[PDB]
Amino acid sequence: NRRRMELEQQRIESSQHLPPIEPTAEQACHLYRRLLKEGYKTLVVTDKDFYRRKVRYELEVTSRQTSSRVRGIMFEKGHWMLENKLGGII
Amino acid sequence: GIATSGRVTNEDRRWWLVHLECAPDVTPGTFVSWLDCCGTHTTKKLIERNIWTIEQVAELDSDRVDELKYKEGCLKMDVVWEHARTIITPLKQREVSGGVESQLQSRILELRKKRELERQRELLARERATVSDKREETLRRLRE
Amino acid sequence: NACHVPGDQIFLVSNSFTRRLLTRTDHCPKCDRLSTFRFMSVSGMVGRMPYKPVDTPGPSYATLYWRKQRSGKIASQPLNEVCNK
Amino acid sequence: WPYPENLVPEGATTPFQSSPVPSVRERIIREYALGPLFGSRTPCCVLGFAGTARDVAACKRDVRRWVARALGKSEADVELGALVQAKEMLLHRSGTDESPRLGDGPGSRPDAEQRRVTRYARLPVQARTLLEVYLPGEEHGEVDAAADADATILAHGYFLQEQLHRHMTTVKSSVAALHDVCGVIYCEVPVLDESD
Amino acid sequence: TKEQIIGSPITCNFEYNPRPVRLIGTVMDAHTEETSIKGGLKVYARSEEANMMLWIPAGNPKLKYEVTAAKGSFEHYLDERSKWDEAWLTGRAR
Amino acid sequence: GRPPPVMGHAKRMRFAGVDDNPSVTHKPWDTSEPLMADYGWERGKLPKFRARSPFHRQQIARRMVTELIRKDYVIVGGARAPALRILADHVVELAKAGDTDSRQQLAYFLHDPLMVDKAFDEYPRRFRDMNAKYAMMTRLKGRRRSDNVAMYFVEYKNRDMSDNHKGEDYTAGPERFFLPPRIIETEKGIQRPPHMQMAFDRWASKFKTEEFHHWWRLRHAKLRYWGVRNVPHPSDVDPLWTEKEEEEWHNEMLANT
Amino acid sequence: FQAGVHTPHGSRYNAARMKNWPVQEVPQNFNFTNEQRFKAKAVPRDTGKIPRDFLLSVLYRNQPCEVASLWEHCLHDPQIVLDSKRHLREVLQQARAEGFVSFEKDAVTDRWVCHLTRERFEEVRALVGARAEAQDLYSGLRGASATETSAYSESFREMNEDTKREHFRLLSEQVADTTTHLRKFQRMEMDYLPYTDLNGKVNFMWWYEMSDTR
Amino acid sequence: TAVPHEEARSRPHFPAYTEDVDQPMVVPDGVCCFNCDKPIDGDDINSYVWVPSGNARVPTTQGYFFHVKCFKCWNCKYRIIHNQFYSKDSRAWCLSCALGRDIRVPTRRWHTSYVNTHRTGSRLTGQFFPRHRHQMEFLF
Amino acid sequence: AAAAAAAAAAAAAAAAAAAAAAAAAAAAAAAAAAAAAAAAAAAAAAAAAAAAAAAAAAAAAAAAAAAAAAAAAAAAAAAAAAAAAAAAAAAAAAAAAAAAAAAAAAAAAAAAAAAAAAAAAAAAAAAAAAAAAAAAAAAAAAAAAAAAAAAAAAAAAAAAAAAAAAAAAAAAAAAAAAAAAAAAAAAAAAAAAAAAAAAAAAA
RNA sequence: UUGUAUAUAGUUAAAAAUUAAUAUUAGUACGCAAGGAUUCAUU
RNA sequence: AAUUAUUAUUAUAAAUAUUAUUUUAAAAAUAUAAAAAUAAAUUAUAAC
């Protein structure tokens, strides 16, 4: 009748692993090369030197006081930025 | 039309024609009950005469439709007759051909061919996102 | 809805027919009798309710438990037939 | 939620769209919009009958057999539109199609609408019902120099209504038979309707 | 034809000055059943954290849209109808 | 302006105009269907006669209808006639339908499951070639003196091709209300259906017993105590159905035995 | 029932047709609209005493019976009181609340198997017998001599000893294949009239006759 | 019933004629007067009292059955007061005159109890629809 | 009064408004009405020794704590059928018939229970003595049926092959008792031949 | 934001809600023959 | 109870009798009574 959603949701326990990894390794250093090299092509309007300072600051404020997955969430968002060709920062 | 009374002008021939986009399934094999103002009763007075499809409804000799509306007591039998008499020939060209610019045939497969490619990326997002993580996990299980 | 010793049946609530609501004699489904059926389950209204849609009567709970048990097994007789003819 | 649950228990779904792309439509519309109108015929005359449609369903055959006699063109060349009995009016406002036919009007005349200028009302109703006359598709209205008169749809109508009002006075007397043995007590060439 | 539209998705657009409102939602009423000037749709449109049932007069220049009928299976309309009631009932500040 | 000059909540009048507008608070039932049950004054409705409740309004309407299906006439009072001629046709728009649900649509309404058959038997063969307005509504020149209520004489129209009242006459009633009523003298030995008498002979023969006579007389005692004037004393009360009196009706009694 | 209204054209059964009902030729290209087939309501079939005992007769010859043999056996009779495979599904829903049929499925297989309940099997033999008490006697050629039965009177005891199913390979079709020649010679007509019982419920009354079609 | 958390009826704590199709509640075919051993008519008489308990004792539905003139106490030959009887050695013994309370007479009517007829005596015992979980109506 | 007034009278209404006093009738509005109207007589509570028979058995299976509300749970578990004529109060009639006649005394620890069986645990031993080994005997007497219920098929394993070879016995005649009125004479003889073409070679 | 003063007027418009006229003609049904058509086919 | 009136005068016995009194074709106030909102039966409502 309705409880089909119960049949659905209990069927969407779906423990395909996916905990955001919380990168505690050089993986952070990868993007901070890929970013400043993928940005260095695009920063026509916005400042090239303001943009480095904020990627620094985001790589401490998110490392300092956040959780595990939300750091694997931020890092995944670093991946999805240049995948989105940028964070629209033109 | 339904709300039309008595005669059928040469205009609402258009209103019948314009509205053939929103009826793509319809064909000369469609059941007569799909006809403007061909309600429940009139159909049963039609079926009693072995008349089923829009196509046969165009064959009536102005005397079946007359003895229908004036002897079988089925009303508005003239505003339905002129309807099948109107869309049969643009529907008859649906028996032989579908859309002419629909199709865009080289396009219609490239829309279909990618929908597999597309709806197989979410299912794989359930996989590609985690197996890429499983590695980013196993890449560090060793470093310590 | 109306059940006695032999078989069962489905009725309704024609507002003129009230003195039959509780105990209407009926030809039993089984071999033969003019059995005096009783009233078991409500099964909703005949006419609509003023400015209330058709679902406001509601058959009953156990009446849902009835057709889902009396008929119920369309998976047990999908043989020779489905909802079509 | 006035839509009852189980309105559509199991639905195949008839598309009701025609290419869900919003751009292909409005172009498939052009044909059926700018395309050719696909059902219309042009009425030649009106055949006004006195009795109602249950008094003609057996005598409505010879009228074809008698207007084909008159137009010379054989039978099975004429398409008589189905009978349309007008409303049993009480107010009797004129102009519409569900209206009865007065003895005088725009096309009812024996080409005598000067009656409208020289009279102060209309003659009473002649035909309670009516019936149209069609032919295989051709032109509409023209004056010809080879028929000694007009020769078109309207002419095939005008040069029939003039002949018909010759029998109301008292070689083809089909227009005289059409009065007595068949039923026609009114003839009128309508206005050529229009669409967008 | 009432059964046909219910549950079918809507694209919208809606003009407006800052930018057009691009919003996707399910149809639920179809007030007129043909091309008359009445129109009306009553979509549900579930934009974001906000739910917003609304009406489209279906003749407006700047209020344009489009309906599609593939995922508009009536058995999807029933769920959308439940999704709103929950959002409706459980937003009463009670 | 954009809102109608009158909002949703305002009662127009009786005999008012249409005054069309957009509104979204109507259609309680399957309106316009052979049993709409709507009752009011604005034209799209049936005239709401004086009943004690909407339910009791239906009960009146039901038993007014299943007396038009036994005796194809009726003498109703006031606003029951318009709302019966309207309902008399609904039954006949429902007779021609004949689908497996109509008889279950009409078995719910009538207080009688027999008349439904008679309704579905005669009316197709009888009202086949009549479009609409099947029932006549003649207003009688009399009036119920009790309450000045104009009595109308509703009846069904086509009764020559009918089956059970093919030649009956309704100038005045029968001799004692339990006899086959007067017939048009041209058709004396006309064969009525063989079953619409089995529900009559079975019935017209309960007013023939001595116990009914002891009801007919007792009923007077009930009335003079109940204050109804002009009721002669239960002492000198002629019996309704006697033995010798019946022979006059035993005259045309040589049909099957 | 028609040629191709609800089931595509070519679905005709050699069963008891209804009286007065012509085979109304539906043209070939005809189709419903999926939203017209929405309601799809049909005529209710007679599930009464005549079909039931008949339904049991073929279930009594075959105490277990499977899906297709449920209808594939009704073709093997002199008189049939079915019109469709849905008229077979209809009475079965009745015969369950009659306690006459509790059919199940065998776990080793995956088909559903008929079985007259043992809470009623001893008595339904009379019901199949009260059909049978004159089912043999009314036969015509039986009662025309003795050498037709006497050319077989001894086989019934010697069949089921050493040639039991040996005859059953023929006792199904060949003895019934002539009924197919006879089905084209004498169907039954499900003449019906609707009515209402004094409770008010709608129902029909079916006057079953054999059609002398020849 | 295990109605989820005390969700039973509010005002009477019980409704009238809750749907009894789950258990047909039919009189037996083999039967006996619990105290006098007399066969009992099926369903068209009131001359037998059904005692349909949660448990089941006497015939096949096994709610007790007496004849209307067979309910009396056995050793003390009286109506049973308050309708709380006591089956002593397979005989319903009047509660008092059974329990060693050797009474000599009741007050109201000494040879016909106030029993009901046709299961009416025990109409406040279970047999609602939610006795067993009965969720098959709701699942998938 | 809306339910009564609204034209189309519902189904609940017709059952609710009924307060008649005929047999098998609405009990609520027979109870609800006047005390001069109700013949809703006293609830026949069974205090049978049978109600003792489903008493001394259970406690020696579970004689712990709180046996006065979930004791009926045992009655809702141990179910050939319960015990309480009225689960509500007959299960509360269970202790008083047990407390009297010197059968059961209570047990109180954080709550009240039915434990300790009051020194009658000997008559609980020879109660269960009249249980399993009484249930053991009767379930095999129907196995005497079920030692021949196997034969019930086996006695008609041949007969269902026999009396379905009798089901043709008449039809074979009637197959041709109607052929008479259609006259094949070739499909007629062979349909009698192909049956007797192997009938006499059988045995 | 200009006049005037170190800060800024002063004017006009757009937006936050419904518009009103007394008296010269035949009368004891429903001002609907009612299910919004001034008879949609005849009975 | 002034009555052919708000009424089962009920000490008792009871349970499938259709067991025999309720006008009216309009409109407001009022009177009873009534779909929607700031886990429960409630509201107020001077709203259809």
Q: CA-nearest residue of chain B to G25?
A: B50
Task: Pinpoint the alpha helices (H) of chain I.
Answer: 2-5, 11-16, 28-31, 50-53, 71-75, 90-99, 122-128, 132-141, 149-154, 159-162, 167-176, 187-196
Q: Is H32 annotated as a binding residue?
A: no
**Technique behind the model:** cryo-EM
Q: How far apart are CA C80 and CA E79, in angstroms?
A: 33
CA of residue F32 to C1' of nucleotide K45, angstroms: 32
Q: How far apart are CA I85 and CA I90, in angstroms?
A: 6
Q: Are F67 and F115 in contact (CB under 8 A)?
A: no
Token readout for I92 is 């509360």
Handedness of CA D117, D122, D123, D125 (dihedral sign): positive
Task: Give the CA radius of gyration of chain D.
Answer: 23
**C57-72 as b/e: b if 16+ CB within 10 A:** bebbbbbbbbeeeeeb
Chain H residue numbers touching A8 (CB-CB < 8 A): none
CA of residue F2 to C1' of nucleotide J12, angstroms: 29
Of H57, H99, H121, the CB nearest to I41: H121
Token readout for H27 is 């009189």
In three-state secondary structure terms, G190 is: strand
Q: Are D101 and D48 in contact (CB under 8 A)?
A: yes
SS3 of G51-74: HHHHHHHHHHHCCCCCHHHHHHCC
Of C29, C76, C79, the CB nearest to G97: C29
| Residue G136 CB burial class (10 angstroms; 0-12, 13-18, ≥19) | middle
Cα of B19 to nearest chain E Cα, Å: 9
CB distance G38–E3 less than 8 Å? yes
Chain C residue numbers touching G103 (CB-CB < 8 A): 76
Q: Are C15 and I9 in contact (CB under 8 A)?
A: yes
Q: How far apart are CA C13 and CA C63, in angstroms?
A: 15
CB distance G200–F117 less than 8 Å? no
User: Chains F/H: 3 or more C-beta pairs closer than 8 A?
Assistant: no
Cis amide leading into B104 (omega within 30): yes
CA A38-A39-A40 angle, to 5 degrees, is: 95
In three-state secondary structure terms, F46 is: strand
CB distance A7–H138 less than 8 Å? no
CA of residue F227 to C1' of nucleotide K5, angstroms: 15
Cα of E60 to nearest chain G Cα, Å: 30
Does C9 reach chain H within 8 Å, measured CB to CB? no
Q: Is H33 annotated as a binding residue?
A: yes
Look up the protein residue whose alpha carbon has the minimum distance to the C1' of K24: F50
CA of residue F215 to C1' of nucleotide K20, angstroms: 11
In three-state secondary structure terms, C34 is: strand
CA of residue F219 to C1' of nucleotide K20, angstroms: 10
Q: CA-nearest residue of chain G to E1?
A: G35
Phi/psi of residue H46, nearest 5 degrees: -105, 5
CA of residue E18 to C1' of nucleotide J1, angstroms: 27
Q: How far apart are CA C23 and CA C34, in angstroms?
A: 12
The nucleotide closest to C38 (CA, C1' atoms): K16
CA F57-F60-F61 angle, to 5 degrees, is: 85
The nucleotide closest to C37 (CA, C1' atoms): K16
Q: How far apart are CA G90 and CA G92, in angstroms?
A: 5
Does B38 reach chain G within 8 Å, measured CB to CB? no
The torsion angle over the Cα atoms of residues I3, I4, I8 and I11, rounded to 10 degrees, is 70
D83 secondary structure, DSSP code: P
Q: Are H52 and H116 in contact (CB under 8 A)?
A: no
Within 10 angstroms of residue E67's Cβ, the number of other Cβ atoms is 21
Cα of C53 to nearest chain D Cα, Å: 7
Report CA-CA distances (Å) from F12 to A72, F9, F41, G110: 69, 10, 10, 70
Token readout for A1 is 């009748």
Q: How far apart are CA F95 and CA F102, in angstroms?
A: 7
Report CA-CA distances (Å) from G18 to B52, G23, G193, G211: 21, 11, 12, 10
The nucleotide closest to F11 (CA, C1' atoms): K27
In three-state secondary structure terms, A49 is: helix
CA atoms in the 13 A half-sphere facing the CB of G168: 17
CA atoms in the 13 A half-sphere facing the CB of C80: 25
CA of residue F13 to C1' of nucleotide J24, angstroms: 29
Q: How far apart are CA D105 and CA D113, in angstroms?
A: 7
The nucleotide closest to F44 (CA, C1' atoms): J36
- Nearest-CA neighbor of F81 among F94, F64, F93? F64
Q: How far apart are CA D54 and CA D60, in angstroms?
A: 10
| Chain pair C-F, CB pairs under 8 angstroms | 26
Phi/psi of residue G196, nearest 5 degrees: -145, 130
Q: Are I172 and G136 in contact (CB under 8 A)?
A: no
Q: Which amino acid is at C10?
A: I
Q: CA-nearest residue of chain C to H20?
A: C40
Q: How far apart are CA H45 and CA H39, in angstroms?
A: 13
Handedness of CA I68, I72, I78, I80 (dihedral sign): positive
Does F44 reach chain I within 8 Å, measured CB to CB? no
Report CA-CA distances (Å) from A26 to A23, A33, I98: 8, 11, 79
In three-state secondary structure terms, I45 is: strand
Q: Are I93 and I45 in contact (CB under 8 A)?
A: yes
Q: How far is residue D138 CA from its own chain's centroid?
A: 16
Chain B residue numbers touching D19 (CB-CB < 8 A): 99, 102
| Chain pair B-F, CB pairs under 8 angstroms | 7
In three-state secondary structure terms, G113 is: strand
Does C85 reach chain G within 8 Å, measured CB to CB? yes
Q: Are A89 and A42 in contact (CB under 8 A)?
A: yes
Q: How far apart are CA D136 and CA D42, in angstroms?
A: 9
CB distance G33–B52 less than 8 Å? no
Mutation target vs C (from H3, H7, H18, H21; most C CBs, 10 A cutoff): H21
Q: Which chains touch C (3 or more CB pairs under 8 A)?
A: D, F, G, H, I
| Residue G99 CB burial class (10 angstroms; 0-12, 13-18, ≥19) | middle
Q: How far apart are CA G16 and CA G25, in angstroms?
A: 19
- Nearest-CA neighbor of G51 among G4, G101, G10? G101
Q: How far apart are CA H25 and CA F131, in angstroms?
A: 55
Cα of G37 to nearest chain E Cα, Å: 13
Query: Chain K positions under 7 Å from a protein CB?
Result: 4, 8, 10, 12-18, 20-28, 32-35, 37-38, 40-41, 47-48
CB distance F62–C16 less than 8 Å? yes
- Nearest-CA neighbor of D45 among D179, D185, D193, D190? D190
Q: How far apart are CA F156 and CA F67, in angstroms?
A: 12
Token readout for G43 is 């005529």
- Nearest-CA neighbor of I47 among I8, I100, I5, I6? I100
The set of long-range contacts for G111-114, using a CB threshold of 8 Å and a minimum separation of 24, is G111/G66, G111/G67, G112/C76, G112/C77, G112/C79, G112/G66, G112/G67, G113/G64, G113/G65, G113/G66, G114/G59, G114/G62, G114/G63, G114/G64, G114/G65, G114/G66, G114/G70
The nucleotide closest to D87 (CA, C1' atoms): J40
In three-state secondary structure terms, E45 is: coil
Q: How far apart are CA F77 and CA F92, in angstroms?
A: 22
Q: Are G115 and G64 in contact (CB under 8 A)?
A: yes
H64 contact partners, CB below 8 Å, separation of at least 6? H34, H50, H51, H53, H57, H58, I44, I46, I48
Q: Which chains touch B (3 or more CB pairs under 8 A)?
A: A, D, E, F, G
Q: How far apart are CA D103 and CA D177, in angstroms?
A: 20
**G108-125 as b/e: b if 16+ CB within 10 A:** eeeebbbebeeebeeebe
F115 contact partners, CB below 8 Å, separation of at least 6? F66, F69, F70
CA of residue F211 to C1' of nucleotide J5, angstroms: 119
Query: Chain J positions under 7 Å from a protein CB?
Result: 17-19, 29-36, 38-43
Q: Are D133 and D44 in contact (CB under 8 A)?
A: yes
In three-state secondary structure terms, F220 is: helix
Cis amide leading into G24 (omega within 30): no
CA G71-G75-G78 angle, to 5 degrees, is: 135
Of A14, A16, A21, the CB nearest to B137: A21
Q: How far apart are CA G98 and CA C7, in angstroms?
A: 6
Q: Are D165 and D104 in contact (CB under 8 A)?
A: no
Handedness of CA H75, H78, H83, H84 (dihedral sign): negative
